[PDB]
């Protein structure tokens, strides 16, 4: 991910139903400790017999078959942003939730003490905001950190609201140790669906919580 250009960032003022992004990051994420695949629909996904307020089954589409069959029989930790509309898990049944990635191995991936990562927020070219994020995983998915960054920003700086946003553009930049940096645009395209937008987590990109930086760039 080569850093973005102003013209490469989606503008929030152009999004008709931007509240559908707000619901994703304001509400609780789906988190599950030490569990293992129970079923599978497509070659690149895994279904779990886990539960939450709105679901009895959870499906996670991963990067591909290779990655799917990799976590298939292991005991994993799940941490993702789920959607319900368009989450087909069979022909007849339902009460299912869907996510992308958000999967890490459970065994020996926890920390004695939670690792605090600093998030340097910059607004209008001026890094003037800074707050802490936390994780107790050694290898954590970008999704988890992302959700935590946006949840705080939404609760404290109004990144998202059940309506328009005070910011026109915005993105999160991940800076791993000895790897190519990458970023996610905070805003979707004028017309989108939650499932389409959330594909940024399909690759299940994981980071070393100990040696990774997080930068946020916003414009009002």
């Amino acid at each position: 991910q080569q850093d973005p250009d102003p013209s490469q960032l989606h503008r929030s003022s152009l999004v008709k139903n931007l509240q559908n992004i707000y619901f994703l990051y304001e509400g609780d994420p789906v988190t599950h400790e030490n569990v293992k695949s129970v079923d599978q629909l497509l070659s690149h996904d895994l279904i779990y017999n886990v539960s939450g307020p709105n679901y009895d089954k959870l499906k996670t589409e991963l990067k591909n078959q290779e990655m799917a069959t990799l976590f298939k029989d292991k005991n994993v930790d799940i941490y993702g942003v789920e959607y319900y509309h368009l989450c087909y898990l069979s022909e007849n049944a339902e009460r299912s939730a869907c996510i992308y990635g958000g999967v890490t191995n459970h065994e020996g991936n926890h920390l004695e003490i939670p690792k605090k990562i600093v998030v340097k927020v910059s607004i209008d070219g001026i890094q003037s905001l800074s707050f802490d994020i936390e994780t107790n995983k050694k290898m954590v998915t970008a999704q988890e950190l992302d959700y935590k960054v946006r949840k705080y920003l939404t609760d404290n700086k109004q990144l998202y609201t059940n309506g328009p946003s005070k910011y026109e553009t915005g993105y999160i930049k991940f800076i791993p140790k000895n790897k190519e940096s990458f970023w996610f645009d905070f805003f979707p395209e004028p017309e989108f669906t939650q499932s389409k937008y959330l594909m940024i987590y399909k690759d299940n990109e994981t980071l070393d919580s100990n040696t990774s930086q997080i930068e946020v760039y916003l414009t009002t």
């Binding site: 139903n17 509240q19 619901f23 709105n54 789920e82 319900y84 509309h85 368009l86 939650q194």
Partner: protein, 236 residues
């Protein structure tokens, strides 16, 4: 089934209001509409499923949330008099066309500058016309409710303790008398023979929804909260 809560609500300008819709049809689609006298049924917000909502045709002034499959809420952050109307909720299977929709009972919301205008009704029962009895063979009772505000009322008839709809003729809608006063009338026709039996009991029941506990009314004055007024009469 589809239910709505609250069913009646009076709010003050600038206040916050929340209408809640509950369904048991397990439909993926839910809708919030409003209907205004002489005007149509207009879509405000709708939802294709839990955790998402879509702007309808007249979204301005309203927010919506779909916390689950069963619930769909309509939020008014800053109530304005223009939002006074009758709100309808609905769930929809399939694609969500009208033939696949199921509506709620409706909610009456009235937004005014202040609550000091809310007033319970005056109810009166009137015996059939002297002449009407004779060469009429039919006896007609007229029930009248007036001086109430806003117009969240229900009028029913009860003969001998059992509710009756047969022979009843109630005005389709409360008609305004003054700027802050409504009127509502109804008629109950029976055989002049029935109206002459001293054993028959006639009762006109009226229910008025005013302010609620949640509302704060200027202490010192009696709070015009919901009321169940009834006018009765026996057969002569």
């Amino acid at each position: 089934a589809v239910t709505q809560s609250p069913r009646n609500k009076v709010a003050v300008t600038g206040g916050k209001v929340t209408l809640s819709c509950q369904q048991t049809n397990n439909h993926n689609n839910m809708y919030w509409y409003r209907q205004d006298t002489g005007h149509g049924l207009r879509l405000i917000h709708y939802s294709y499923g839990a955790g998402s909502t879509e702007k309808g045709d007249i979204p301005d002034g309203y927010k919506a949330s779909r916390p689950s499959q069963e619930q769909f809420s309509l939020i008014l952050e800053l109530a304005t008099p223009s939002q006074t109307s009758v709100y309808f909720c609905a769930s929809g299977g399939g694609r969500g066309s009208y033939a696949e929709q199921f509506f709620g009972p409706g909610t009456r919301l009235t937004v005014l500058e202040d609550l000091r205008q809310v007033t319970p009704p005056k109810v009166s029962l009137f015996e059939p016309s002297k002449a009407e009895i004779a060469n009429k063979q039919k006896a007609t009772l007229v029930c009248l409710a007036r001086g109430f505000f806003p117009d969240h009322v229900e009028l029913s008839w009860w003969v001998n303790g059992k509710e009756v709809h047969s022979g009843v003729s109630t005005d389709p809608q409360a008609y305004k008398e003054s700027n802050y006063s409504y009127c509502l009338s109804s008629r109950l026709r029976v055989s002049a023979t029935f109206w002459h039996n001293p054993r028959n009991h006639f009762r006109c029941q009226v229910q008025f929804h005013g302010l609620s506990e949640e509302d704060k009314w200027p202490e010192g004055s009696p709070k015009p909260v919901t009321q169940n007024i009834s006018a009765e009469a026996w057969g002569r």
